[PDB]
C-alpha cells in the first residue's frame, strides 16, 4: 500500500507537488573529479575514481544512479559491480519493495535486478506516510520509510516515533544524507552510529570489526569511504545545537498565489529564498551572509587540498615501498595511518555543505587527518631508506582527470563506451517493463 | 601632563576606580609550562622556555613583569637580558616616560633602567585622555596613549581619531592585546600589520625583512615568536565581524547602587556577569553557552597537542641530523618548514581567548601548521637516511616541565635562586627610590 507514483498526489496537493517537481530546474551536473583530479588517486581501485559529480536536484537521483559510471553496464539482472542497496536513497519504489518483499528480500542481489522496479523519482512516500487518511487532508504524517534509518535513529537515543515534530523534520533527511556502509552478505545499508556520530566514534566502529570498503590499488591500503554525513555534521554545528532544522533552511514556509502558507518542496540552495530562510532569524543582509559562507568555504577548500596533496604523496610512496619489496608486516603500520588519515579527510569534506553546517568541525577533522598523513609519510621515508631509497618519490602527471585516470590504470575509453551502450539500450527496456507492470505512468 | 598615579582619580571617579582596582581579585597565576612541557622544547633558547604563565588581572601586570624569570636578575641599569620595551604594555608610567623623554628615549637601553620609574599599575592614562576637561565630567575621552599603536591602526586603514566610538572601544585593548616584535637597534615596539593581520600576511612581513625572534637551540631554526594576538583574531571572528567589541563582553555597562550607569572596569571573564554580557544579545542560558565554549576549547586543545608533538619530534630530529653531520645548506629547507609550522601553531594558540573569539581561525591555522610540520619531518627522515640513520629518533623524557627544562640544559635551581634574590633585594630599592622621587605614593 505505499504509493510510489508521485503524480497520484498532484490533484490533492498542488503546492507541494509543483515545488517538489521544480527540483528539475536544479540540473547542472558538475564533474567533481575534473575539478579535483587528486580524488582519482585517493579513490584508486574504487568506483568513485571513475565518476563522481556534485549532487543536483532530487528529481535527478534516479537518472544519476542509472548514468553514473559507478554502476557500470550490467548485461543482466545478475551482473554489474554493485548491489541492490545502491537504489536505497534514490526512489520511493525502495519503500514499495521493502514493504512488498521485506528488507532482506529488497537488499538481495545486484543493482541491475532493481532496474525495472525502482523507477519513480525521489518522492512523497520517501518522507510521508501517504497511506494515512490524514495525509489526503493535508497533514504531513512524516515517516521513516527506511527501516535501517529507524534503527539508526534509535541507536543515537532518538527513536523517531517519540521525537517531537521538529526533531522528526531533520530525521527524514537523515534517512539518506548520512555516512553509511554495506553490512553482511546481502550488503544491507547500515549507519555506523552505535558509538555516536563523531568522526572518532565511527572510526572506532569500523576498526573494531576491521571493516574496509576497498583496497587502494596504489598503496594496498584497506580504506574507508565516507559519504555525505550531513545529519552527523549538522548535529555537531551551531545551527543543529540550536534546533535549527534542515527544513528551516531548505524547505521554508512560503505563501502561494492566494496567500496560503505551505512548505516549499523545491529543495535546494537556501540562499535562493533568503527572505524566507536566513532573514527569519538574522538581521544581516544577504550579501553579508553569503560572504561569510564563501570565506568558510575557501578556508576549508585550501586546507583540504593541502591534506589531499599529502595523501597523494603517501599513496605513491607506499607503492614505491611495495615495488622495492616491502613485506605486509612492514606496510601495516603505514597502511593504518593512511586509512585513518583518509577517513578523516573524506568524512570532513564528503559533505558539500560542511562550510555552512559545521565549518569548525570540518576544519578540526582536516587537522586530525593531516596528523596521521604526516605519520604515514615519515614512516614511509624511513621504510624506503631501509630499502636503499633516500630520494623524493616522483609522482606521475595527475594534472587532469583523464591523466590521473590513465595513471591508475583505468581504460576510460572502453568504460565510457560500455556505459553509453547500457544507457541507450537497457534503460528503455527497464522503463518498458515498469510501465507494463503499472509501476510507472 | 600624563598622570600615572591612578589613585589621583579615586575621589572624582569612584565607580570606575573601585571596579578597576578589583582586577586584583583575579590573582591566580597558572603555570602554562607545567600544564604543557612541550612548550619548553618549542621555545628552547628563548626566555619563554624558562617561565610562562597564563594571564591574570591587570592589577598584576607590573608585578608579573618584575617577577618573571624571563626578565632575569639585573644587578644594575645596563644589566639583564631584556630591553626597555618589556615595560610598554604594563603601566601608565610608560605614557609618562614617552611624553617626558619621547618614544626613542623611552625605548633606549635595558628593562632594568626603567625599574625605579615604571611603578604604577596599568591604569587610567593608558586608555584615557585624563587631561581633557571632559574626563572629570564623566566622559571617557578614549585615547591611544601608545604611538606605535596609533601608527599600527593607521596601517590597517583605521586611524583612531577618525574611527567611530565602537571601533575606538576595541582599539584601546588593541594597544597591548596584539602580536608585536622589537624593531631596530633600540628595540622599539612594532605591530607586524603593514600587509594586514592574517597569519599569512604577518608571515610575509617577517620573511620580507628576514626577521627572527631567536634561534631554537635544538634545531638551530631561526624562529618567530607569537604574542597574544587578540585584536587580530577577534577581527577575524564572527563577533568582530558583527562589531561586537571587546567591551561588550569584558567591560559591560552596569548600574551603581544609586542606579547611575557606568562601565564596569573589572576586566575579566565575561561569564562572571553573564546577565550583562552574553545575555544582552543571546537567549540561550549561561550553562548552554559555557558548554559550547568549553567544547571549542577542548577541540583546539586536542588538535594543538597533536601539532606540538609533531614539532617536538621535528626539533629533536633536526638536532639528530646536525649531530650526524648535516650542513647549513642541507638544514635550510627543513628549518624554513619548522619556522613556518611553528609560526602558524604559535599564532593560532598564543591567544588564550581564541576558542571564544575566532575558533574556526585557530583551527584553520593549526591545520596549516600541521602541513608544514609534516614536510619538515619527511625531509628530515630522508636527510637522516643519507647519513645512515633509518630508525625513529628517540626523544628525551619531557613528561614534566622540570624534565623538559633539564633536557634543554637550563639550570633551573640556579636561575630561580638568582630571581628570588633580585625579587627580595632590588624590587624594594626600586619602589623606595620611586617613592623618594614622587613617582609612587
Ligand atoms: C551504491 C554504491 C550507490 C551508488 C552507485 C550511488 N549511491 Fe548515492 N547519494 C546519497 C546522497 C545523500 C547523495 C547526494 C549527496 C552528495 O552526493 O553529497 C547521493 C548522490 C549520488 C549520485 C549523484 C552524485 C554523484 O556521486 O555523481 C550518484 C551517481 C549516486 N549517489 C550513486 C545517498 C546514498 C545512500 C543513502 C544511505 C546510499 C545507500 C547510496 N547513496 C548508495 C549509492
Ligand atoms: C510529493 C510530490 C510530496 C507531496 C505531495 C508532499 N510532500 Fe512533503 N513535506 C516534507 C517535510 C519535512 C514537510 C514539513 C512537515 C512539517 O511542517 O513538520 C512536508 C510537508 C508536506 C505537507 C503538509 C502541508 C505543508 O505544506 O506543510 C504535505 C501535504 C506534503 N508535504 C506533501 C518532506 C518531504 C520530502 C522530504 C525529502 C519529500 C520528498 C516530500 N515531502 C514530498 C512530498
Ligand atoms: C530532507 C527534507 C532533505 C534535505 C534538506 C535534502 N535532501 Fe536530499 N538528496 C538525495 C540524493 C540521492 C541527492 C543527489 C541527487 C542527484 O544528484 O541526482 C540529494 C540532493 C540534495 C540536495 C542538493 C540539491 C541541489 O540542487 O544540489 C539538497 C540541498 C538536499 N538533497 C537536501 C537523497 C535524499 C533522500 C533519499 C530518499 C531524502 C529522504 C533526502 N535526500 C532528503 C533531503
Ligand atoms: C539537515 C541535516 C540538513 C541537510 C540534510 C542539508 N542541510 Fe544544508 N545548506 C545550507 C546552505 C546555505 C547550503 C549552501 C552552501 C553554499 O551555498 O555554499 C547548504 C548545503 C547543503 C547541501 C549541499 C548542496 C549542494 O549543492 O552541494 C546539502 C546536501 C544540504 N545542505 C542538506 C543551509 C542549511 C542550514 C542553515 C541554517 C541548515 C540547518 C541546513 N542547511 C541543514 C541541512
Ligand atoms: C541562511 C542560509 C543562514 C545563514 C547563512 C546563517 N544562518 Fe544562522 N543562526 C541561528 C542561531 C540560533 C545561531 C547561533 C548564534 C545565536 O545564538 O544567535 C545562528 C548562527 C549563525 C552563524 C554563526 C555560526 C557559524 O556557523 O559560523 C552564521 C554564520 C549563520 N547563522 C548564518 C538561527 C538561524 C535560523 C533560525 C530558524 C535560521 C533559519 C538561520 N539561522 C539561517 C542562517
Ligand atoms: C581593553 C579594554 C582590554 C581588554 C578587554 C583586556 N585588556 Fe588586558 N592585559 C594586559 C596585560 C599585560 C595582561 C596580563 C596581566 C598579568 O597577568 O599580570 C592583561 C590581561 C588581560 C586579561 C586577563 C584577565 C584575567 O583574569 O585573566 C583580559 C581579560 C584583558 N587583559 C582584557 C595588558 C593590557 C593593556 C596594556 C596597557 C591594555 C590597554 C589592555 N590589556 C587592555 C585590555
Ligand atoms: C577585543 C580585541 C578582545 C580582547 C582584547 C579580549 N577579548 Fe575576550 N573572551 C571572551 C570570553 C567568554 C573569554 C573566556 C573564554 C573561556 O571562558 O573559556 C575570553 C577570553 C579572553 C582572554 C584570555 C583570558 C584568560 O584569562 O585566559 C583575553 C586576553 C581576552 N578575551 C581579551 C569573550 C569575548 C567577547 C565575546 C563576544 C568579545 C567580543 C571579546 N572577548 C573580545 C576580546
Ligand atoms: C558572552 C561571553 C557571549 C558568548 C558566549 C557568545 N556571544 Fe555572541 N553573537 C552575536 C552576534 C551578532 C552573532 C552572530 C550570529 C548572529 O548573527 O546572530 C553571535 C554569535 C555567537 C555564537 C555562534 C558563533 C561562534 O562564534 O561559534 C556563539 C557561540 C556566541 N555568539 C556566544 C552577538 C553577541 C553580542 C552582541 C552585543 C554579545 C554581547 C555576545 N554575542 C556575547 C556572547
Ligand atoms: C605590545 C604589548 C606587550 C609587550 C610589548 C610585552 N607584553 Fe607582556 N603581555 C602582554 C599582554 C597582552 C599579556 C597578557 C596576555 C597573554 O599573555 O596571553 C602579557 C603578559 C605578560 C606576563 C604575564 C604572563 C606570563 O607570560 O607569565 C609577563 C610575565 C610578561 N607579559 C612579560 C613581558 C616581557 C618580559 C616583555 C618584553 C620581552 C613583554 N611582556 C612585552 C603584552 C605585552
Ligand atoms: C584598559 C582600558 C581602561 C583603563 C585601564 C581604564 N579605563 Fe575607563 N573606560 C575604558 C573604556 C573602554 C570605557 C568605555 C568607553 C565607552 O563606553 O565608549 C571607559 C569608561 C570610563 C569613564 C566614562 C563613564 C563610564 O563609566 O562609562 C570614565 C570616567 C572612566 N572610564 C574612568 C577610568 C578611571 C578612573 C580609570 C582608572 C581607575 C580607568 N578608567 C581605567 C577603558 C579603561
Ligand atoms: Ca548542487
Ligand atoms: Ca561509508
Ligand atoms: Ca586568566
Ligand atoms: Ca612576536
From Swiss-Prot, chains A, B:
Biological-process GO terms, alphabetical: anaerobic electron transport chain; nitrate assimilation
Record note on quaternary structure: Homodimer. Component of a membrane-associated heterooligomeric complex.
MF-aspect GO terms: calcium ion binding; heme binding; iron ion binding; nitric oxide reductase activity; nitrite reductase (cytochrome, ammonia-forming) activity
Enzyme Commission number(s) from the entry: 1.7.2.2
Pathway in which the depicted protein is active: Nitrogen metabolism; nitrate reduction (assimilation)
Chain positions recorded as heme c 3 binding sites: 58, 173, 176-177
Binding, heme c 2: 124, 127-128, 265
Protein name: Cytochrome c-552
Cofactor note: Binds 1 Ca(2+) ion per monomer. Binds 5 heme c groups covalently per monomer.
Catalytic activity: 6 Fe(III)-[cytochrome c] + NH4(+) + 2 H2O = 6 Fe(II)-[cytochrome c] + nitrite + 8 H(+)
Xref: InterPro entries: Cyt_c552, Cyt_c_NO2Rdtase_formate-dep, Multihaem_cyt_sf
Protein keywords: Calcium, Electron transport, Heme, Iron, Metal-binding, Oxidoreductase, Periplasm, Signal, Transport
Main location: periplasm
Binding site for substrate: 180, 228
Subcellular location as annotated: Periplasm
GO cellular component, one term: outer membrane-bounded periplasmic space
Amino-acid positions noted as binding heme c 1 in the UniProt annotation, renumbered to this chain: 86, 89-90
SUPFAM superfamilies on file: Multiheme cytochromes (SSF48695)
Gene: nrfA
Record function comment: Catalyzes the reduction of nitrite to ammonia, consuming six electrons in the process. Has very low activity toward hydroxylamine. Has even lower activity toward sulfite. Sulfite reductase activity is maximal at neutral pH.
Induction comment from the UniProt entry of this chain: Full induction attained in the presence of nitrite. Subject to glucose and nitrate repression.
Reported regulation of activity: Subject to competitive inhibition by sulfite.
Positions bound to heme c 4: 246, 249-250, 357
Residues where Ca(2+) binds: 179-180, 225, 227
Superkingdom field: Bacteria
Keyword check for Oxidoreductase: yes
